[PDB]
């Protein structure tokens, strides 16, 4: 049984995956190249609809480190606005609080504040 698609799951997860997801974005050396960024926008744009939880978190993360700052540009904010509403949605399980738990934790992950 071979397949080179998505990880398998969608968004329905528990605190188990949440701990793993944070570990994916915990690294700061993931900063994508500018020449490749133009094409990365395309793949990541589909990850918002077809991409799994482990992918959504990588998407918004790349966009955050691509700017190297907190208040992202209008261009990154366009796709990030969607990936944000999905970031806290899956992680909501382990959040056990307001959206600020994950939304503000971005500063601790991407080192913004």
Automatic annotation (TrEMBL):
Signal peptide: none annotated. One of its GO terms (biological process) is rRNA transcription. This is Transcriptional regulator, CarD family. It comes from Myxococcus xanthus (strain DK1622).
């Amino acid at each position: 049984g071979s397949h080179m698609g998505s990880v398998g799951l969608r968004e329905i997860i528990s605190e188990e995956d949440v701990k793993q997801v944070y570990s994916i974005l915990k690294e700061k050396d993931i900063s994508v190249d500018s020449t490749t960024w133009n094409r990365r926008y395309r793949e990541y744009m589909e990850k918002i609809k077809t991409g799994s939880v482990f992918e959504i978190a990588e998407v918004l993360r790349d966009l955050y480190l691509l700017k190297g700052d907190k208040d992202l540009s209008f261009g990154e904010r366009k796709m990030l606005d969607t990936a944000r509403s999905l970031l806290i949605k899956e992680l909501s399980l382990a959040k056990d609080c307001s959206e600020d738990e994950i939304e503000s934790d971005l500063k601790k992950i991407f080192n913004l504040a």
